[PDB]
UniProtKB/Swiss-Prot annotation:
One of its GO terms (biological process) is translation. One of its GO terms (cellular component) is large ribosomal subunit. PROSITE patterns: RIBOSOMAL_L1. The keyword Membrane does not apply. InterPro entries: Ribosomal_uL1, Ribosomal_uL1-like, Ribosomal_uL1/biogenesis, Ribosomal_uL1_3-a/b-sand, Ribosomal_uL1_arc, Ribosomal_uL1_CS. It comes from Methanothermococcus thermolithotrophicus (Methanococcus thermolithotrophicus). This is Large ribosomal subunit protein uL1. PANTHER family: 54S RIBOSOMAL PROTEIN L1, MITOCHONDRIAL (PTHR36427), LARGE RIBOSOMAL SUBUNIT PROTEIN UL1M (PTHR36427:SF3). CDD domains: Ribosomal_L1 (cd00403). Part of the 50S ribosomal subunit. Probably involved in E site tRNA release. Binds directly to 23S rRNA. Protein L1 is also a translational repressor protein, it controls the translation of its operon by binding to its mRNA. Keywords: Repressor, Ribonucleoprotein, Ribosomal protein, RNA-binding, rRNA-binding, Translation regulation, tRNA-binding. Belongs to the universal ribosomal protein uL1 family.
Amino acid sequence: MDRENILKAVKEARSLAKPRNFTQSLDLIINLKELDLSRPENRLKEQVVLPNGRGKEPKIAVIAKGDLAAQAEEMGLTVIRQDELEELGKNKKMAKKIANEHDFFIAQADMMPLVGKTLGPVLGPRGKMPQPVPANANLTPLVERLKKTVLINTRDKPLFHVLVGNEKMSDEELAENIEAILNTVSRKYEKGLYHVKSAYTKLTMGPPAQIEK
């Protein structure tokens, strides 16, 4: 899992991927070996800020009110104010829709029990429960980080995928994105990257090419 060998598997995944009428994204498949995923201390669940971003920007919703919601409308983010949160509670159709349409949710801190009550049946099963920020937080740092945030999640199984980017990125960029994920498996566990049995790269409709080591 050294650079020149990630760069090689990124290149072999591209070359083997028959071109399509959309920009295919590159997925990383990690196989974990020797770990007990019945103990939660061994389950990886991290937010990694990829250095080079993630291909298309993720849609972000801001459940707030006041200045914090004045900033998000300004940034062009989807704003769900308190009033609109109450109606969404009565309407499970419109609630599964906002959830399946946004990648990340940010809620104003004090609105979280009210989001727990109203949108909670939706986002919680979906894993999109909002990240709380102070009522006076500046959303610009936060939204910057989140535009390049993906989420490693083993749940209970020795296997996971993470998107590391798309076709329109260089091999070098996708190398440093994959290396940013691997450096995280390595940081968690004390034997390090010994728990990576095999690791593959793949385009959306490409074949998978394993990273040599």
